[PDB]
Structure 1
Amino acid sequence: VYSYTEKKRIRKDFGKRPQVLDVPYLLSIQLDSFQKFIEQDPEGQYGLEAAFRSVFPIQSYSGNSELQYVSYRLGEPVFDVQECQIRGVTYSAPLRVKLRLVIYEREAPEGTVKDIKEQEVYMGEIPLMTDNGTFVINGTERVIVSQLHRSPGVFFDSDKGKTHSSGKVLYNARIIPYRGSWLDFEFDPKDNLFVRIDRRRKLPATIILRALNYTTEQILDLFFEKVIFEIRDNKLQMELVPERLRGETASFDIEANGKVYVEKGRRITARHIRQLEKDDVKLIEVPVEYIAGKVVAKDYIDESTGELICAANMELSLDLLAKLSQSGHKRIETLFTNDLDHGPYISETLRVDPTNDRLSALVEIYRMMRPGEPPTREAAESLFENLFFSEDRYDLSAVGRMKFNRSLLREEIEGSGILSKDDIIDVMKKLIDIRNGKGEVDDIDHLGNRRIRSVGEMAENQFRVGLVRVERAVKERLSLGDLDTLMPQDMINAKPISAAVKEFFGSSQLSQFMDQNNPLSEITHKRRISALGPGGLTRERAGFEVRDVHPTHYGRVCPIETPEGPNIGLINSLSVYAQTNEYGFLETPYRKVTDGVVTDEIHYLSAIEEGNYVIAQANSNLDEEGHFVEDLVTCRSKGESSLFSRDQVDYMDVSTQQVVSVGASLIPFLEHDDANRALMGANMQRQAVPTLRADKPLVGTGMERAVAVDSGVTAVAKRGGVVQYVDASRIVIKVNEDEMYPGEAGIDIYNLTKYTRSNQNTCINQMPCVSLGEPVERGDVLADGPSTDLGELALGQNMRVAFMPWNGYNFEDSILVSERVVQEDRFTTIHIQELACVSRDTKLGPEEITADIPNVGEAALSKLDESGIVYIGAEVTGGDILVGKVTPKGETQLTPEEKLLRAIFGEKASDVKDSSLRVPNGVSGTVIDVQVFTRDGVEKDKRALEIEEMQLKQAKKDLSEELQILEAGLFSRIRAVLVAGGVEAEKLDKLPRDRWLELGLTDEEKQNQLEQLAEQYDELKHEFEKKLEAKRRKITQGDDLAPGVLKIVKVYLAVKRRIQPGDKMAGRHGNKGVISKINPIEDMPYDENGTPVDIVLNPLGVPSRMNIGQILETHLGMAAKGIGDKINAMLKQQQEVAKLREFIQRAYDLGADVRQKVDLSTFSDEEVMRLAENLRKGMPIATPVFDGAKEAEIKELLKLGDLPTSGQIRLYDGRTGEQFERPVTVGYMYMLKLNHLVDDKMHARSTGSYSLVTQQPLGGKAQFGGQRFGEMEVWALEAYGAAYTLQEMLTVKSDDVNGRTKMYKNIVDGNHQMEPGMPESFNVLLKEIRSLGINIELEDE
């Protein structure tokens, strides 16, 4: 059932919901998105392929010459990731693209076969994505965050009572393309429709309709119905649709062929409507006064004269009806316009519309967007076509068209990027339907209207801008350039495409520093969604509606994961089982329910699709592949939860964990924690610095192993087999025949990344977690990362915690830790630190790096070598020189006093001064590495030459080992093939191996195997040389640096900082704290057994906080250690393998109805003792997120360890010896050391540098700056009365130049005298106001 690395230490799982869908790869979105951007798709355009097809082919203004795209290719990277991180260069690939100059004949119509030139042109190096979903830019792992923006398509919206004073809800519409102008339709207070493009000025909505050739008559025959008015003899008649006289008062006596139905001033209810419809009433006689007010639909000209009696869209009257009847028209069409149902909007809009026909509308539209410029028929028609109706300037895209059509209730899903006439009108129609009553507005916060836009798509966008920048230079140089001489590459520029993509992988809000101070930080930062960025929100533009949690988020985005900064609802981590839809919306897995039986077929419902169905919750008890047991099932549909019957159930939540994120999945007992504290806990779990010793968590969830492995930091077995060679530096594994490929030897190599720097200057080391010659299964963890242990994630350490107050040393979340925790160096952290020494070129001359430095003691030059560089391993402290650098100085004017003092000693300052790299003030560690980058042609130090000697010889032995292990492994197979055919075992292995490849067999399939192994041996033999040459070349190669820079020495220190008062610690339920005192072991509390407590927390930091999960974690952690201490006791006593089998078996099957079932009869004797050995520190326990352990299960486990139900033990004061008055909650809580360490935070300054203009102190410890005394702080001393305290901080501590130097001298003289003046910042204000042209002067006493 369980694999080999799982057999070493099984987590007792308290789950009860069988995981039908296993956790997917957590870094899927980063890899799959970028994979589309680079994968050259043949037809289904995506990424680079789509970019070229879209822009090319580009043709000239003469139309004779054009450039055409063929095909592109990615070249192998100049430096691999290994060497990019070192030299400090972008990990990118040459983009080589085939482009052809096709020229047409100007004499012939299109004489296509004239010149067909061809060449493969370089344009830019696109950055490549690593295996872990990172981009190495200038030697830094960086992650591009996926964006959540408003989807393209149509979306109807309404200002409720923000528009106007009356509170007319003005409904509106927006057609949003992926590229091109916006199209807004909106009402006004007075219910007239209007149109604005790109939110320009308001234009009558009928103006775009006229521009699309719609006559007045056609416009009314799109929105309005028809009422035919027949004039018979004398009495006027009207064609009735009974349904139209609906909830209306009868204005006249409605009477038909022979029956009065409704009287004057009487409401026509549903019954009067069916009375007329059952009697099948068609024409009704009506008064002539009834048309007074009706709007005539079409034009009615006199047949007799031939002139307008009444134009379309005009209100009729008795004099017009008289003229119509007598002229020769006894059948009038009329607009049907109800006040509440079918509203007259377009009709009143047409009277506001100043335009007459098609051409008048196009002028008016041209006059808006291009104002002042006289219009022409060419300019007006061409602009309007280039807005929405061009292949070039407009594109909704596939998502835009699909969302557009599905909004308008269309049949067609895919279609054209260009807006058609139907589209514009259909949208105006649906806008009017929403105003009428049927139809509602869509909300923007719905994730069905929020589309996810990952890296690949945003890289494609910026790459397209690169090709658009080249489009200018192509059309330019095609016209001017000769046709014969011109090749395509003379017209292309590589710098615009390089620059536009480099802007994205550099300047962009979404491209940023990978938070890698913890595997959990890395993996949840890659799973991040920001609604900020280009084409998205701003904090300026962010309301509260977008910020808060939305029904749709459920299962797509975690509601308990977001920063507590200004970006509180904007940034968001992705849920566990969430995925990007084919189009881009989010989607969540759901088990289908057919015939009431829950099928294991899973459907990833989109935000839109989820609303139809009813989804049962995961809480619902299945009959173990029957159906819902309970008759009533708790389910949710249409954004709400209620109870339902079983046959009505359509779907069910796949897992218990799906509403939460990766951060939150790792919180145990999240179910008992407040959302507010749970948020901070998941956010601080990411900030947990990995410790010296990776300790497992005793109280996990089980997601630990998913996170550690998917994060990429753990070295995992690509293929299973026996480990041939184990070492701290590397692991070499031989593969099993079944998975091993028949070609190569089949020996995998894992050179483990060793004590190396992170982006937060923390440590990264990979330790081998398998022994010499151990059998390993495929997909097992061969080596543990910095914050991982036997495959499981290890962010911090677990320890004996007692909740009780202590002399106010745990006052406000203040933490009291034992000396023993500090003594064990378990919370001690490694901080690798990078400091660079650069020799530049000044005006006076180039800078030297030698041990020959003016003004230096022998204490500083002692740790430097001949070249002037510190030895590897040498301990250094603030002041000590790491790299000796000296700079030229002009012959400076020595003041007579200095000239005396230099003539007194004799040692006069030389022409070259000094600027050596020295250890930063206060920091101190051991030098673990030094790396030297000399420019091609400049003088090399002898140390640099030793490093080249070191790298070369090491490279020779490293590739020797590559060919050696590969040769030995390759003949090992040949020997097995040679036995199958001509078995001569002992006698063939005596004489040399070198002539084994000549030996063959009779011609079988196994002879063909010998041939591939012999040819591949020579392939590796010839490849060994060209590989060794590449390493040798790169090592001899001068590293090409910035302008001015001659060479750089990068020194790496290693600080080993232990915990101290001020350091920030926390658990996983948002329970913060600062160490206050390291209490001696002698003083700490201890139980009757005698074992002292590690940490003493304040119990008053629990009820207020409402984070009770920390207490359940403590109780269960106690139970877990209780089992460990029992097994530890049984291993010390050395009882029996059958006894350990019984106790461990009863432990794993202790829960009421446990999900996992570990039969120990399957485990052999040797396997059990490896397991017991790891469980003795404490049995790791898994408490899934919402499907966790109950109190009863924890109390039951406490009885297995012979510990109290209560989880509270009688402790005794270490100082005195007497007992505390009551039992105290003690147990094991997994705590975490946060990155906020006090050695970094502490700062102080008396006197230092000053700013240029303000002349105030600098800011921050990074600049060694003074503290900001803001207006808030000014009001405090104002309020007290202390005006001297204030004036001190306003003048002599700040700007006053004469004040600050004089006061320093007063205090050294002893006299604490206030001798002030006036801030230079005021003098600046005066000159800045006078430069504005404003006389400001000091009118004196």
Structure 2
Amino acid sequence: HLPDLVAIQRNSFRWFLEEGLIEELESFSPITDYTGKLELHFLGKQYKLKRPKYDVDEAKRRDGTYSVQMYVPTRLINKETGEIKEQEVFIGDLPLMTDRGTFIINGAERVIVNQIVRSPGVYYKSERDKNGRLTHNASLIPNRGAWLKFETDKNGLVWVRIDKTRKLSAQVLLKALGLSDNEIYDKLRHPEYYQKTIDKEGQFSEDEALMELYRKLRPGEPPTVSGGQQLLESRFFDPKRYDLGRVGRYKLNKKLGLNVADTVRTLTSEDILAAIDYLINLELDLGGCEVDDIDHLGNRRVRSVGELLQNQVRVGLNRLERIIRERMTVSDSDSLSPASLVNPKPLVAAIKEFFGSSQLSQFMDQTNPLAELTHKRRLSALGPGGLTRERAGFAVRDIHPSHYGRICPIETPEGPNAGLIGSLATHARVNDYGFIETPFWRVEEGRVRKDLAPVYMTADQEDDLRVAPGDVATDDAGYILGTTIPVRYRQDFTTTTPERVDYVALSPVQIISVATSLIPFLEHDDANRALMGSNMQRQAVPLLRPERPLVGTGLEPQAARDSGMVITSPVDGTISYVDATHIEVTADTGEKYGYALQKYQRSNQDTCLNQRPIVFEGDRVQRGQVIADGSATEKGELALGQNILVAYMPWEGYNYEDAILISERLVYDDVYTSIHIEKFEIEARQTKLGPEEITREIPNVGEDALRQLDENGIIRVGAWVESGDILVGKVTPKGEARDVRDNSLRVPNGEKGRVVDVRLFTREQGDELPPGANMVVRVYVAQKRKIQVGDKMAGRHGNKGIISRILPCEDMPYLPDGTPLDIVLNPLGVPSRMNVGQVFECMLGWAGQLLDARFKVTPFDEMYGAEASRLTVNAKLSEAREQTGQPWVFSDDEPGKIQVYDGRTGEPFDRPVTVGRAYMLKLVHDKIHARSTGPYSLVTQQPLGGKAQQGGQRFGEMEVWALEAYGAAYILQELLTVKSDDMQGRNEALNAIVKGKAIPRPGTPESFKVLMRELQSLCLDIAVYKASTEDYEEDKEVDLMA
């Protein structure tokens, strides 16, 4: 029943376009100047949209932005003359969301992350003193504005703490609101508790209430009744400075039991009085009151591109209104038109900053369709309005029972981000208030009603019901089998009779995410290794020829249709034109449909986004049938790895501690080879001496290194470039003909491949070049990488490894039929890591290879039997043995083990080993770095850091301690001074090494001199001294800076 997987990102933009921008335009529409003579009305319900310029593909290839233009009709009304100059004004450029849920900003694909924040409303909490009783406080939190904290003292006093200022008894606030004693006495249920505060703090009247409120809020100024009134109105009553939100109003009504309309979004007297009454009742233990949990998913909300955009648009609109008022009052003549009144610079700037430089808009993860899919379904606890890494603690990063079926308990990062970024579960969805829901089937008298439609439910809703998991087994029709059934009641796990179960989860994978739903035999894995496998499945690399798993899980065809890279026919007809770049299908009786396929493009992570056709010319095709496939899909479904022969046994030390020993077939059969495309860029600028020219007249170079340039100084498409090869030839006019200097762009050390695209952008061609540049040349270089020593290989169950040896296939162990193995894995890593599921897949994959079959096993498959996975695997292996005819395939004494021989000597190993077909992946990432001497930092004169600029390795203080514990003094002193920042000792050491002499003694490193200068610059007379040798002499200050 899986709906659209990337729908949290669409619904929020469809909502923004439909009623998110309108609400914000109308909220600021009537702009009036101070004289009240001119008025600007923004008829924001009629904003039209201009068709996007360029195209999606054109924006991508031009390195531009995919956007539209917004035009709202406006009417400037003269308050007297009454002349109304109706017009349509340009408001801004709105980047548009593509069909895949993403945006194209500056020619790069970006995704707006979803932020999990605390929902607006009122939250009660009880705090316990070291020796005192329980004291209760309440926090009222709006969508946007100031917070209202209430607190109960140890003596029974009620305090309010506007903002972060000092407290003030609640009587001041209630009287300042314009409430007499009788109404606040009647609304409260236990009035004597508040009467104690009234007596202790004195009954304030409205005038003195506002005086004291102004005095406490803004000390040092003479109090003024009007001053206070205005302060309160601006603080909690101003529609443009306090917004509860729709969710805030909903939560307030639900918690406090009010009935206020949904349209009012500011605090009202009723609200504060109710909140106070609830606090009093909670203090007195009335019965219908309860403190709040802030980690509950019923008190937490999800914001997506629509809300975050709305807020940015609101800020821009405030700035625009300020500019409009300024450029409206100044005018002494009504010669202004609405076109000349609005300035779209602040709104354009706000939207651009949000989409390009915010920390909620993120560079897309695009290694494969799975990473792309889970990047759009990600929930973050960090950002402008959430948490910070140093403030997030143990409580926030844990699994709250209310995550069941809404947030995956497995898929997270490892490290500083553990528990702060999560993934939406498989069936979960977000409703229009911002709370995550999840579907259930209704159960009537122990019968699961799959005929009726799934009933979705939020975290707070499913707290009073007894909900059964999705792995409960039912008989024919729907009755639940068994006598005891696990249920969840009030965030607890219990067991009940199957006549008292209210709801049942839709699927057994309803609790996990999509990446974790792709791991077969998951219930035989530890949770940590499941986390590793789910994380590593999104780092796999699309291979040269992908291949489906044999023991897939059933969600592969659905995990690939959302990335928008697989083409399916919507039409039940015939195929008339097939090509490497075009497919055409003619409807049985109808029009022709034509599709263009992307070819060897480049992703954010330098992988390849190819697209290939599957069908042949003149082929009968049905609707919904796969027509073309992506770079990580085979025929409809995800394909991230390859199926290879694996045996579990140790080699001669090559399996030691997670290392992997593979065969040479994975290299020459082009298994686990991939295409990676990189981009290089060169800029022609204009220096004060002169401009920079792209030409082949490069100094100090011979014609043997200008072979592949295109008589314009730029390399040619289809040329093989090795390291140090010139890509674009550039000359700078240096100042000291024989005047030009060479700074042509070259391939970095360790890079090679073919040149596939050389795009050129100059201001003449109508391109948006940078401010000071006169030509931007971009070159794309593609290469094919094979598996090699040092690469990371992985499985779906968390078993990672680094390849340490590639053996010729006549050295690898072989089977009783002569087939050498492909990979040998250490079994020492299986039982201590508890990822037994890998030992099941192999075996089932073995059967699948022998039976020419593909198995779709779903996780948690043991609801049908006592040991379902083992029985299915054994039966499948026996069936494969009977069909093939070879008895060595399967043995009854050792089911999963068969005999394996030694390729080096021909002798069989002492005991049979476990062999099978395993689905292994090749992980991304270029890490080898070395340095002798290179660039240095500006202030400290220490070597720079970074692979791309010949950077050095940092010798931290832990390494200094390690060298101090060894007794090393000369290694430490050479590392600290001569090799880092002894500005004169570096050259002397290098010259001594080159000449072959001894390295001289070092001096004072430059960072010490920098520190002494900075300390002197702090008005400190710190200095270095040389002690006097004889008696009647003064110590002499030593000049280091000489």
Corresponding residue number in structure 1 for 2:34: 61
Tell me whether 790-799 or 713-722 shows the greater mean CA deviation: 713-722
Corresponding residue number in structure 2 for 1:1186: 860
Q: Counterpart of 2:55 in structure 1: which amino acid? A: D
Corresponding residue number in structure 2 for 1:258: none
Corresponding residue number in structure 2 for 1:835: 680
Q: Counterpart of 2:507 in structure 1: which amino acid? A: S
Corresponding residue number in structure 2 for 1:158: 126
Pairing 1:1265–2:943 present:
no
From 913, 928, 940, the counterpart of 2:741 = 913
Confirm or deny: 8 A CA contact 2:188 2:274 kept in the other structure: no
Confirm or deny: 8 A CA contact 2:449 2:478 kept in the other structure: no
Pairing 1:1195–2:874 present:
yes
Q: Counterpart of 1:376 in structure 2: which amino acid? A: T
Pairing 1:479–2:479 present:
no
Structure 1 residue 369, shift from structure 2 partner: 2.6
Structure 1 residue 153, shift from structure 2 partner: 1.2
Structure 1 residue 504, shift from structure 2 partner: 1.0
Structure 1 unaligned spans of 5+:
1-21, 40-45, 106-112, 227-334, 336-343, 741-745, 893-908, 937-1036, 1125-1178
From 774, 784, 787, the counterpart of 2:632 = 787
TM-score, structure 2 as length reference: 0.94
Tell me whether 699-708 or 173-182 shows the greater mean CA deviation: 173-182
Task: Tell me, in whole angstroms, the C-alpha distance in 1 between the residues paired with 2:998 and 2:801.
Answer: 40
Deviations 1:85-113 (A, max 9, x none): 122111111111111112212xxxxxxx8
Task: Tell me, in whole angstroms, the C-alpha distance in 2 between the residues paired with 1:483 and 1:50.
Answer: 32
Task: Tell me, in whole angstroms, the C-alpha distance in 2 between the residues paired with 1:215 and 1:96.
Answer: 50
From 502, 507, 518, the counterpart of 1:666 = 518
Task: Tell me, in whole angstroms, the C-alpha distance in 2 between the residues paired with 1:1046 and 1:843.
Answer: 14
From 839, 857, 860, the counterpart of 2:702 = 857
Instruction: Give matches, 1:129-278, under 5 Å.
Output: 129-160=97-128, 164-166=129-131, 168-215=133-180, 219=184, 222-223=187-188
Closer/same/farther in 2, CA of residues 1272 and 355 from structure 1, 3 Å limit: farther
Instruction: Report the structure number with the largest CA radius of gyration.
Output: 1
Closer/same/farther in 2, CA of residues 1315 and 131 from structure 1, 3 Å limit: same
From 215, 222, 225, the counterpart of 1:367 = 215
Structure 1 residue 222, shift from structure 2 partner: 4.8
Task: Tell me, in whole angstroms, the C-alpha distance in 2 between the residues paired with 1:865 and 1:506.
Answer: 35
Structure 1 residue 843, shift from structure 2 partner: 0.9
Corresponding residue number in structure 2 for 1:868: 713
Corresponding residue number in structure 2 for 1:1309: 995
Confirm or deny: 8 A CA contact 2:214 2:224 kept in the other structure: no
Deviations 1:1174-1228 (A, max 9, x none): xxxxx22111122375100110000111132512111011111101110101101
Instruction: Give matches, 1:336-355, under 5 Å.
Output: 344=193, 346-353=194-201
Confirm or deny: 8 A CA contact 2:988 2:1000 kept in the other structure: no
Structure 1 residue 120, shift from structure 2 partner: 1.0
Corresponding residue number in structure 2 for 1:991: none
Corresponding residue number in structure 2 for 1:430: 278
Confirm or deny: 8 A CA contact 1:1118 1:1207 kept in the other structure: no
Deviations 1:369-407 (A, max 9, x none): 322232322211111122222333222121111111101
The root-mean-square deviation of aligned C-alpha atoms, in Å, is 1.7
From 277, 291, 294, the counterpart of 1:441 = 291
Pairing 1:1209–2:898 present:
yes
Instruction: Give matches, 1:718-1117, under 5 Å.
Output: 718-737=570-589, 740=590, 746-890=591-735, 892=736, 910-936=738-764, 1037-1117=765-845
Deviations 1:536-590 (A, max 9, x none): 1111221211210011111111101111121211111100111111211000011
Task: Tell me, in whole angstroms, the C-alpha distance in 1 between the residues paired with 2:770 and 2:965.
Answer: 55
Q: Counterpart of 1:1310 in structure 2: which amino acid? A: G
Structure 1 residue 796, shift from structure 2 partner: 1.1
From 701, 711, 715, the counterpart of 2:553 = 701
Structure 1 residue 138, shift from structure 2 partner: 0.7
Pairing 1:504–2:354 present:
yes
Deviations 1:912-948 (A, max 9, x none): 2121111111201111121111221xxxxxxxxxxxx
Task: Tell me, in whole angstroms, the C-alpha distance in 2 between the residues paired with 1:917 and 1:225.
Answer: 80
Deviations 1:1224-1277 (A, max 9, x none): 0110111111113xxx11100011111110100000212211110001000001
Task: Tell me, in whole angstroms, the C-alpha distance in 1 between the residues paired with 2:785 and 2:945.
Answer: 26
1:798 counterpart SS class: strand
Task: Tell me, in whole angstroms, the C-alpha distance in 1 between the residues paired with 2:769 and 2:316.
Answer: 26
Corresponding residue number in structure 2 for 1:391: 239
Structure 1 residue 1315, shift from structure 2 partner: 2.0
Closer/same/farther in 2, CA of residues 626 and 1060 from structure 1, 3 Å limit: closer
Task: Tell me, in whole angstroms, the C-alpha distance in 1 between the residues paired with 2:624 and 2:314.
Answer: 40
Task: Tell me, in whole angstroms, the C-alpha distance in 1 between the residues paired with 2:336 and 2:573.
Answer: 60
2:710 counterpart SS class: coil
Structure 1 residue 48, shift from structure 2 partner: 1.0
Corresponding residue number in structure 2 for 1:108: none
2:984 counterpart SS class: helix
Task: Tell me, in whole angstroms, the C-alpha distance in 2 between the residues paired with 1:1113 and 1:930.
Answer: 45
TM-score, structure 1 as length reference: 0.74
Structure 1 residue 1084, shift from structure 2 partner: 0.3
Corresponding residue number in structure 2 for 1:404: 252
Task: Tell me, in whole angstroms, the C-alpha distance in 1 between the residues paired with 2:195 and 2:469.
Answer: 51
1:1338 counterpart SS class: strand
Deviations 1:1038-1058 (A, max 9, x none): 223111211122111112121
Confirm or deny: 8 A CA contact 1:517 1:689 kept in the other structure: yes
Structure 1 residue 216, shift from structure 2 partner: 5.4
Q: Counterpart of 2:195 in structure 1: which amino acid? A: S
Instruction: Give matches, 1:496-645, under 5 Å.
Output: 496-600=346-450, 601-645=453-497
Confirm or deny: 8 A CA contact 1:819 1:1079 kept in the other structure: yes
Task: Tell me, in whole angstroms, the C-alpha distance in 2 between the residues paired with 1:399 and 1:1191.
Answer: 49
Confirm or deny: 8 A CA contact 2:566 2:628 kept in the other structure: yes
From 1017, 1021, 1024, the counterpart of 1:1335 = 1021
2:329 counterpart SS class: helix
Q: Counterpart of 2:812 in structure 1: which amino acid? A: M
Structure 1 residue 875, shift from structure 2 partner: 0.5
Structure 1 residue 493, shift from structure 2 partner: 1.2
Pairing 1:492–2:342 present:
yes
Confirm or deny: 8 A CA contact 1:730 1:750 kept in the other structure: yes
From 83, 99, 107, the counterpart of 2:58 = 83
Structure 1 residue 1107, shift from structure 2 partner: 0.9
Task: Tell me, in whole angstroms, the C-alpha distance in 2 between the residues paired with 1:1267 and 1:594.
Answer: 67
Tell me whether 776-785 or 873-882 shows the greater mean CA deviation: 776-785
Corresponding residue number in structure 1 for 2:886: none
Task: Tell me, in whole angstroms, the C-alpha distance in 2 between the residues paired with 1:1071 and 1:1312.
Answer: 50
Closer/same/farther in 2, CA of residues 839 and 614 from structure 1, 3 Å limit: same
Kindly indicate which of the two structures has a greater share of residues assigned to helix. Answer: 1
1:887 counterpart SS class: strand
Structure 1 residue 124, shift from structure 2 partner: 1.8
2:756 counterpart SS class: strand
Closer/same/farther in 2, CA of residues 224 and 659 from structure 1, 3 Å limit: closer
Confirm or deny: 8 A CA contact 2:547 2:642 kept in the other structure: yes
Corresponding residue number in structure 1 for 2:917: 1228
Pairing 1:1299–2:985 present:
yes
- Greater RCO between the two (CA within 8 Å, min separation 6)? 1
Confirm or deny: 8 A CA contact 1:709 1:781 kept in the other structure: no
1:1193 counterpart SS class: helix
1:208 counterpart SS class: helix
Task: Tell me, in whole angstroms, the C-alpha distance in 2 between the residues paired with 1:877 and 1:93.
Answer: 43
2:487 counterpart SS class: strand
Structure 2 unaligned spans of 5+:
863-867, 882-888, 1028-1042
Task: Tell me, in whole angstroms, the C-alpha distance in 2 between the residues paired with 1:596 and 1:59.
Answer: 65
Corresponding residue number in structure 1 for 2:69: 94
Corresponding residue number in structure 2 for 1:1141: none
Ranges of 4+ aligned residues in structure 1 off by more than 6 Å: none
Corresponding residue number in structure 1 for 2:1032: none
